[PDB]
Amino acid sequence: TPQICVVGSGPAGFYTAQHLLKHHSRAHVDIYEKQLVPFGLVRFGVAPDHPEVKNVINTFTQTARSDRCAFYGNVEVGRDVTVQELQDAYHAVVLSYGAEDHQALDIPGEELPGVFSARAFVGWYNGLPENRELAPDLSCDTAVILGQGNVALDVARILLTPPDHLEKTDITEAALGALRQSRVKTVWIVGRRGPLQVAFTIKELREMIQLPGTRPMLDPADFLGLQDRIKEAARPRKRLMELLLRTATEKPGVEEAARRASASRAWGLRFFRSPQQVLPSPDGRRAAGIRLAVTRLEGIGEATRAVPTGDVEDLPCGLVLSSIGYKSRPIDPSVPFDPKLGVVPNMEGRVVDVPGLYCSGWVKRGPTGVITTTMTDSFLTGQILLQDLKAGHLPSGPRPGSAFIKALLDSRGVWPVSFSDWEKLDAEEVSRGQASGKPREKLLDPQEMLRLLGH
Ligand SMILES: Cc1cc2nc3c(=O)[nH]c(=O)nc-3n(C[C@H](O)[C@H](O)[C@H](O)COP(=O)(O)OP(=O)(O)OC[C@H]3O[C@@H](n4cnc5c(N)ncnc54)[C@H](O)[C@@H]3O)c2cc1C
C-alpha cells in the first residue's frame, strides 16, 4: 500500500492525485492544503463570469470522495507539518503549492492607495480570505492595468461589466455591492511591447470586444503593417491578431457604430509604454496617474525587447493594477529553492537532490500555464512518480502515511478540515446562493467558516 502525499489542492494537486489513483490500484493519496477549502485558483483565480472554467471541480470532487483519497485542509506545510515529516511518513511527496507571491512593480509611488496587484483584486472579488478587506476605491473614473494577458482582461471585464450582468454569478456580495457604486468608466490595458506581443487568448479578447455597454479603443497606428507580419503566424495567433486588427481598423456598420456611441463605458489597449512611476494626488492620499516611459522595439520575434525612447507620457487614473508575474514562495528548509525563477529546482518533476520529493504545476514549471497545461504537466510528474514507485526506487515496505502525521497534528493542536467537512461548507454556500439566484454565496470570514466546517 503505497502512501503518497500531495502539498496543495489546486489543479496541480488534484490532477496529480487523479493520475496516481487511476494508474495505481492500491496507492493512497493524501492532499494537504493551507486554506480551509480546496481547489486553489479554480475558486480564487478564475473569474466569476467564467463558471464554465470552474467545472473541473466536479472531477476533483469525485477524486476526493474516493476510498483512496483524503483531504487535509487548514494544514500549512512548512509550518504545521514539515516537509521532512511528510518525507518520513510517505513513500513519495509531491509539492504542488503554486506560485503565491505576486511580482511588485518596484517603481516609485507603488505605495499610493489605489495601487494593487491584479491578482489581489481578483482574490477580493473571488473571496480569498486574505484579500477580503482589500477595499479598492472605485470612486475614480479611470483604471490602468499593466500587462496584456488574460488576467488583465478579467479585471477590465469585471470593472466594466454592467453590474446586473454579474448578479447570477458567484462573485462576492461584498464586491458586487462595491461594483454597483463604482464610478470607473474607462479601463486602459498597457503593455511595454506591441500588438504582436500580447498574451491574451481569443475567447477572452472577444468577450472584451463584445462586452455589453462598452466600446473598444484601439489606435490603428499601432497596427500598421500587422497583416504582413502575421502571414507566417500560427493559426490561433493569426486569428487573434486578425480580430485585433479588424477591431482597430474596420469601420463599423451603422448599428455597431450606434451601439458604440451609446456605450457609457470603454476599454482600450495602449502599447510601447513601461511603468515608470505612480503619480500622487496633490495631498498624496491616493494615486492620480501613472508616468510611463515610451518604448520602441528591438530584436526579432520572441527575442523582441522594449527599449526606452526617452519620451514619457502621463496618464491620469485612480486605480493602477499590476498584472505581470508571480513567483513560488520558499516553503521549508528541506526544499531547495531557485529565487530567480521562483520555482523548486527540478528535473521533469523530480526535485533536485531530494529522493522521493516531486513537484507539479506552477511550483514545477513557473506560472505560465493555464489549467489544461497544469493538468498535462501533472500527468507527466505522475508518470515519473509511478514508474519510480513501480521500480522500487522509493522506500521499501511500510510507511505510515496520515496515521503518523495525524499523531503529530493531534499533539500540536492542528485540526485539519476533511473533505466531508468541506462538503458541509459547500452545501451551506450553495444554499445561501438559492435566495439571491447565485451558484453560491461564499463565506469570507475564516471564523464563520470554521463554525460552518464543524470546527
Ligand atoms: C487571476 C487568475 C485567473 C486565472 N484564470 C484562469 C482561467 O480562466 N482559465 C485557466 O485555465 N486558468 C486560469 N488561471 C491559471 C490557473 O489558475 C493555473 O493554471 C492553475 O491554478 C495552477 O495550479 P496549481 O495547482 O499549480 O496552483 P494553485 O491553483 O495556486 O494551487 C496551489 C494550492 O496550494 C495551496 N498551498 C500553497 N501553499 C501551501 C502550503 N504551504 N501548504 C499547503 N498548501 C499550500 C494553495 O492554497 C492552493 O490551494 C488563472 C490564474 C490566475 C492567477
Dist. CA 360 → ligand 1 center (Å): 11
- Count of CA atoms in the C-beta half-sphere (13 A) of 177: 5
Atom 20 of ligand 1: nearest residue by CA position: 371
**Torsion, Cα of 129, 107, 205, 236 (10° steps):** -110
168 within 8 A of 433, measured Cβ to Cβ:
no
Tell me, in angstroms, the distance from the centre of ligand 1 to residue 46's CA.
Answer: 9
Asked if residue 371 belongs to a known ligand binding site, the reply is yes
Give the distance (Å) from ligand 1 centre to CA of residue 41: 4
Q: Is 319 exposed, middle or buried (0-12, 13-18, 19+ CB in 10 A)?
A: buried
Tell me whether residue 149 is annotated as binding: yes
Is 93 annotated in a binding site? The answer is no
How far is ligand 1, taken at its centre, from the CA of residue 314, in Å?
35
Catalytic residue check, 371:
yes
CA 23 – CA 6 distance, rounded (Å): 16
- What's the rounded Cα separation, in Å, for the pair 360 and 381? 6
Resolution value (Å, 1 decimal): 1.7
- For residue 220, report the phi and psi dihedrals to the nearest 5 degrees: -50, -35
Instruction: Give Cβ neighbours of residue 436 (< 8 Å, ≥ 6 apart).
Output: 167, 173
Least Cα distance to 289 among 142, 107, 182, 106 occurs for 142
- How far apart, in whole angstroms, are the C-alpha atoms of residue 167 and residue 152? 21
**CA–CA distance, 157 with 177 (Å, rounded to integer):** 16
User: Is 33 within any annotated ligand binding site?
Assistant: yes
In angstroms, rounded to a whole number, what is the distance separating the alpha carbons of residues 341 and 361?
14
Residue 154 bears catalytic tag = yes
For ligand 1, the distance from its centroid to the CA atom of residue 370, given in whole angstroms, is 9
Q: Which of 9, 35, 41 to mutate to test the pocket of ligand 1 (most atoms within 8 A of CB)?
A: 41
Catalytic residue among 30, 49, 80, 154: 154
Give the domains, in start order, of the chain with CATH numbers. 1-39+56-101+327-455 (3.40.50.720), 40-55+102-326 (3.50.50.60)
50 is catalytic: yes
Instruction: Return d(Cα 97, Cα 11) in angstroms, integer.
Output: 10
Q: What are the Cα distances from residue 264, in Å, to 118, 247, 249, 267, 289? A: 23, 19, 22, 11, 22
Give the span between the Cα atoms of 144 and 162, in whole angstroms.
19
Does the annotation mark 59 as catalytic?
no
Q: Which of 4, 145, 158, 371 is catalytic?
A: 371
169, 438 contact by CB (below 8 A): yes
Spatial separation of the C-alpha atoms in residues 126 and 107, rounded to whole Å: 27
31 to 17, 86, 197, 357: CA distances (angstroms): 8, 11, 38, 15
Using a 6 Å CB cutoff, which residues line ligand 1? 7-13, 32-35, 40-41, 45-46, 50, 53, 76-78, 96-98, 100, 119, 122, 151, 154, 331, 361-362, 369-371, 374
User: Of the listed 23, 50, 102, 393, which one is catalytic?
Assistant: 50
> Cell 445561501 belongs to which residue?
432
Residues 338 and 349: beta-carbon distance below 8 Å: no
For residue 27, which of 8, 6, 57 has the smallest C-alpha distance? 6
Asked if residue 344 belongs to a known ligand binding site, the reply is no
Q: How far apart are CA 101 and CA 387, in angstroms?
A: 32
Q: State phi, psi for 299 to the nearest 5 degrees.
A: 90, 175
The method of structure determination was X-ray
CA of 95 to the centre of ligand 1 (A): 13
∠ CA 395-338-298, rounded to 5°: 140
Q: Which residue has the cell 489605489?
A: 114
